Amino acid sequence: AMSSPTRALGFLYSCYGGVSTDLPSAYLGEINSTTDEYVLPYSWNTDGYWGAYAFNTASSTNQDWLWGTTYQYIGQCYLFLQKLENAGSDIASDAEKEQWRAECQFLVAYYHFATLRRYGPIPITDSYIPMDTPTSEYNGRFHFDYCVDWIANQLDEAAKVLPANRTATNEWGRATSTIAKAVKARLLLYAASPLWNGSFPYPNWQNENFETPGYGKALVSNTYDKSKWERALAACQEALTLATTSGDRELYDDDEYYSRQSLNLPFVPGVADVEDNKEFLKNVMKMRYAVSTRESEGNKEIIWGLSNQFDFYSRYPLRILKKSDGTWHAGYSGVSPTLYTFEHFYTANGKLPEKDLDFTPSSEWFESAGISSREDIIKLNVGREPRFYAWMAFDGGDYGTKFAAGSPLKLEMRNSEMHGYNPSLFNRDHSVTGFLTQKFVDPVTEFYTAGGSTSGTSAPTILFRLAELYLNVAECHAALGNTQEAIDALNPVRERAGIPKLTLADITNNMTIKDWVHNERFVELWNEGHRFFDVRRWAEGAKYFGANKREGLNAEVQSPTFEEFNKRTTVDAPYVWENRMYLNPVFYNEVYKNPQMVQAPGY
Ligand SMILES: [K+]
Ligand SMILES: [K+]
Ligand code: NI
Ligand code: NI
Ligand code: NI
């Protein structure tokens, strides 16, 4: 696709340039910092787009135009393909051309999907568009179900050609059949969901002067279609089977990496480092490593990951460690897990705290657990599942392993001169809720008194991993009424996390199979850029993202007593949900420039 093999390869490489769009876990990104998982300080709303999307002040002139990027790279793909058709065998063999075409095909499909999941019905662009094209020829949005069918067919075509697995040798992760099928699986699952399968809030939203074959001017189905779940199940089953066979993927299950890295097991309240507790404590560290390790470190769970990194300082506590020069290593402490998060991670028995007969009643959750020398730890934070201690952090508990000059950092969230609220000292920065997260934080992370620090070796940012494929299959079985099979899909994820398996006995009028799947997803994929899309596709924006839903402790008052601090407090920022927020508004200019384009409803 130009004047030499090296040139053409470089051109192909540039086609992958858009895959970091809506990067998971980047704290300024709206798909990350606008959900009920966690909140950022309201004063941080001047930075990035998260504020606009969280508080419903996004508009056609105040938006994240990722559409611009995705169609930019789609064009780059078809431009490549066009040049490659005129390319001789001195550029690439026929077999290699086929590979390159499949890579571009996958990319075009993925880029469309990345646009679809944010904007809804989109124009299908399946060729290079010369800029002297008459505006009357521009495609408008195609009906959502038309879009789904095309993307799915494009992913299936690419999967026929692409290899199922590749060796990780550098930072360029090229497409596989495994990735193609996993994208399709997530696509069809989304398509079968309430928002796109019977619960779209604007049933009369439609095209004005553009037709979709099979649908006329309609844009979204307004009627439940069970066949969508049937096709989603088959797609999810296929993706899982492929990944676990020639994809050579398996859930990360190493219990001893911490040991090979010369680390101590973590402090967990009520679970002392003794022989009878080793399994639990080792599960805690396993779950820390599960989302912070390379394939070369032994992780074979990641299906698609990127070299692109995201910031950690935003989740670190305020004062980390006093250097020998008297100044402090410091974090921003802004990523602030909600009570919703602290109430929906499981108990040690694999149940919701509220539902668990063997767990503290909600009336006592904010009382001290009375743990000697760690009296700040409340009862809610004792007796939980390994994933909770792996990924969360709280007053009186530890942050990290080697964090503060080789030792774990004890959190003092009520201390205005350590990790607590104090605008005069820390300016904008503080935990909004009194909690923190340490997900993705490398256990080897260490700040040095002499200055400097290490965050250990870097890890890919996950786009797709295998645990998701289990959860997807589980969700399809649940929708179809296949209760045992839904349970069978959830259980490998539960067992790996060190909580009990579900049986039919666990499925009741107090905890349905759909409850279990959705909560397993909330936990396992926490802060991996899913909750944004999942709450939307489930059409539960009002329920989880609405005004006053977000809660935490009394963490925005200076130097509170234990009793003042530990009180359920509504997060004090103008969060709202309105139905227009299901969709990303189209850039003002695009709506103006394309006569066949319609704006999202309410924008
Ligand atoms: K790989
Ligand atoms: K407890
Ligand atoms: Ni309806
Ligand atoms: Ni209870
Ligand atoms: Ni228009």
Side-chain angles (χ1 to χ4, degrees):
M2 200 206 139
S3 52
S4 83
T6 288
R7 227 75 172 80
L9 191 62
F11 202 124
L12 177 62
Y13 175 67
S14 77
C15 295
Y16 285 80
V19 296
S20 65
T21 295
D22 268 348
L23 187 79
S25 316
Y27 77 102
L28 288 189
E30 67 272 11
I31 70 162
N32 301 306
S33 293
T34 64
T35 77
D36 57 349
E37 294 185 342
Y38 71 79
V39 295
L40 301 173
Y42 181 60
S43 67
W44 287 20
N45 83 86
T46 56
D47 310 301
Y49 277 114
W50 76 267
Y53 287 89
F55 304 128
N56 193 26
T57 58
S59 73
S60 61
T61 62
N62 187 27
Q63 40 70 49
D64 179 16
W65 190 226
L66 64 99
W67 174 312
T69 303
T70 56
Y71 282 107
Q72 176 196 312
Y73 280 100
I74 288 158
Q76 181 79 354
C77 286
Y78 283 113
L79 188 55
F80 175 89
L81 291 170
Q82 173 180 118
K83 291 171 183 181
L84 191 69
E85 278 180 25
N86 294 318
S89 63
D90 57 313
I91 302 307
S93 77
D94 285 354
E96 190 180 23
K97 284 177 180 182
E98 180 186 46
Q99 283 304 317
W100 291 358
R101 286 196 300 263
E103 285 181 74
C104 291
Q105 185 168 37
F106 164 78
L107 282 177
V108 169
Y110 177 71
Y111 289 136
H112 275 90
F113 170 64
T115 312
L116 181 90
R117 69 183 174 190
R118 289 292 310 273
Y119 292 86
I122 56 173
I124 300 309
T125 304
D126 64 336
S127 62
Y128 186 71
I129 308 172
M131 183 176 282
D132 74 310
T133 300
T135 63
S136 64
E137 275 181 26
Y138 294 163
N139 279 343
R141 309 177 185 251
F142 291 84
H143 188 290
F144 191 91
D145 295 340
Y146 183 101
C147 295
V148 167
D149 190 76
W150 184 82
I151 294 165
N153 288 345
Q154 294 293 298
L155 291 162
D156 280 337
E157 286 196 3
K160 287 178 184 163
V161 171
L162 301 165
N165 182 46
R166 301 177 181 269
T167 314
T169 71
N170 51 34
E171 298 188 319
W172 182 19
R174 299 171 65 182
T176 57
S177 57
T178 303
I179 295 169
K181 288 291 173 176
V183 175
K184 178 191 172 178
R186 195 190 290 176
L187 169 73
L188 292 198
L189 169 64
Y190 281 21
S193 297
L195 185 69
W196 302 118
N197 199 10
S199 298
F200 190 73
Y202 304 97
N204 299 325
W205 178 54
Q206 56 173 213
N207 274 322
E208 278 140 40
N209 59 11
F210 189 78
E211 314 270 336
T212 307
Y215 307 90
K217 289 181 187 181
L219 286 175
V220 184
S221 173
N222 296 318
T223 299
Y224 175 71
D225 181 344
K226 185 184 170 188
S227 78
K228 287 179 178 180
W229 278 115
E230 288 171 352
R231 285 191 310 274
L233 172 59
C236 291
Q237 286 171 322
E238 206 199 336
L240 182 58
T241 295
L242 178 55
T244 58
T245 53
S246 56
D248 189 43
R249 307 295 78 191
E250 61 191 28
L251 298 172
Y252 186 77
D253 202 33
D254 189 355
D255 289 322
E256 299 294 335
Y257 193 32
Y258 83 99
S259 190
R260 296 195 295 276
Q261 297 220 296
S262 297
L263 306 181
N264 300 318
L265 288 171
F267 168 80
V268 170
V271 186
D273 193 354
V274 298
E275 189 62 22
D276 300 270
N277 291 334
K278 292 296 193 176
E279 180 168 32
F280 184 102
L281 296 174
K282 288 184 190 169
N283 284 331
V284 170
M285 295 302 287
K286 168 168 59 182
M287 295 313 305
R288 296 194 170 160
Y289 279 118
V291 301
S292 59
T293 49
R294 299 179 175 183
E295 183 135 3
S296 67
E297 288 171 288
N299 191 318
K300 309 210 306 176
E301 189 177 338
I302 297 169
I303 293 179
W304 194 7
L306 307 181
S307 63
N308 309 65
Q309 299 293 288
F310 52 88
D311 165 81
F312 293 105
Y313 283 92
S314 53
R315 69 188 53 215
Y316 294 163
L318 294 169
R319 275 170 168 181
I320 296 170
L321 174 78
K322 201 178 201 168
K323 287 181 273 186
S324 299
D325 66 8
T327 72
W328 290 84
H329 286 287
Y332 305 152
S333 188
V335 179
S336 314
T338 58
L339 270 170
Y340 184 92
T341 289
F342 267 56
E343 294 177 15
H344 288 81
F345 270 59
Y346 295 118
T347 65
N349 311 294
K351 301 167 187 178
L352 290 177
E354 169 58 35
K355 308 281 190 178
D356 195 336
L357 287 163
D358 300 305
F359 191 82
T360 311
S362 62
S363 62
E364 293 165 12
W365 284 354
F366 301 95
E367 291 176 357
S368 176
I371 301 163
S372 182
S373 73
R374 295 205 187 241
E375 291 81 10
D376 282 325
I377 302 177
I378 61 175
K379 287 175 188 178
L380 177 58
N381 297 339
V382 180
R384 309 295 298 269
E385 71 172 315
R387 271 175 303 189
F388 174 86
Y389 300 104
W391 295 343
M392 299 304 149
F394 46 80
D395 198 24
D398 285 354
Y399 196 104
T401 294
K402 293 278 188 162
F403 212 68
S407 298
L409 169 65
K410 181 174 177 172
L411 292 183
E412 305 175 64
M413 303 297 302
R414 309 181 292 105
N415 190 329
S416 64
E417 301 272 334
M418 277 304 278
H419 307 133
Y421 179 81
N422 186 349
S424 78
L425 179 60
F426 300 115
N427 305 129
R428 296 187 313 170
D429 297 345
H430 65 268
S431 168
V432 184
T433 62
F435 305 131
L436 293 177
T437 174
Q438 61 194 304
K439 198 168 179 182
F440 310 119
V441 176
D442 191 316
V444 168
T445 304
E446 178 171 8
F447 294 76
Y448 306 121
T449 56
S453 62
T454 179
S455 71
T457 269
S458 72
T461 293
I462 300 157
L463 296 188
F464 289 75
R465 65 179 171 99
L466 186 68
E468 189 202 335
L469 294 195
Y470 286 99
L471 295 166
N472 293 347
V473 166
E475 184 164 349
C476 300
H477 276 313
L480 291 168
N482 307 333
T483 313
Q484 185 63 66
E485 282 170 285
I487 291 174
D488 291 346
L490 290 180
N491 276 340
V493 168
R494 289 178 67 88
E495 185 162 22
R496 189 271 297 274
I499 60 167
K501 305 191 303 179
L502 296 169
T503 64
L504 283 179
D506 295 305
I507 312 311
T508 73
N509 288 328
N510 287 353
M511 193 81 185
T512 65
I513 189 57
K514 188 209 276 189
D515 284 336
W516 284 111
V517 177
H518 290 200
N519 199 78
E520 201 69 36
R521 199 182 183 86
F522 173 86
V523 177
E524 179 69 13
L525 304 178
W526 196 89
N527 196 201
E528 285 178 54
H530 287 272
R531 187 70 174 167
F532 181 94
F533 298 104
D534 289 330
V535 171
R536 280 176 170 76
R537 67 182 172 90
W538 291 330
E540 297 175 315
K543 176 166 187 185
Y544 295 115
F545 295 171
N548 284 36
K549 298 299 167 175
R550 298 166 180 79
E551 308 182 318
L553 306 175
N554 190 18
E556 298 192 319
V557 297
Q558 192 164 331
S559 304
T561 60
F562 172 95
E563 194 177 89
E564 294 161 357
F565 185 63
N566 288 291
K567 293 171 182 238
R568 186 175 305 274
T569 308
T570 308
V571 169
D572 188 17
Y575 296 97
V576 298
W577 186 264
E578 301 297 341
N579 288 338
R580 79 176 180 175
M581 291 167 66
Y582 281 107
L583 301 185
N584 195 21
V586 183
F587 184 29
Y588 187 91
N589 194 282
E590 256 300 311
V591 173
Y592 178 79
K593 157 188 182 177
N594 177 3
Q596 282 71 247
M597 176 58 52
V598 288
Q599 182 57 266
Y603 286 109

